[PDB]
Amino acid sequence: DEDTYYLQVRGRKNFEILMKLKESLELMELVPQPLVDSYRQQQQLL
């Protein structure tokens, strides 16, 4: 998906965790698929 969603969260520490995961989930999409595939292959070998 590509479109934009809003949420509200109570608690600054909750907000800080969600903003850290918002960042990693959004940036994750810019990682080339071949590196995602090697990474998943590694997690499998464990």
């Binding site: 995961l21 994750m28 810019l30 990682v31 998943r40």
Partner: protein, 54 residues
């Protein structure tokens, strides 16, 4: 960079944590030019703050 071991009950929780962990680790593969482009996008997103109206 010690290899720590998270005990997880159940598939649903394990898979959720895996997807989060993946997203956290795979950022390392991004060039800073990519990170800076994202950061500017995020900064410009502020120009138009969220507020409760409608």
């Amino acid at each position: 960079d010690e290899l720590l071991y998270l005990p997880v009950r159940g598939r649903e929780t394990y898979e959720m944590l895996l997807e989060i962990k993946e997203s956290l680790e795979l950022m390392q593969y991004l060039p800073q030019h990519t990170i800076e482009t994202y950061r500017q996008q995020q900064q410009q997103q502020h120009q138009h703050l969220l507020q409760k109206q409608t």
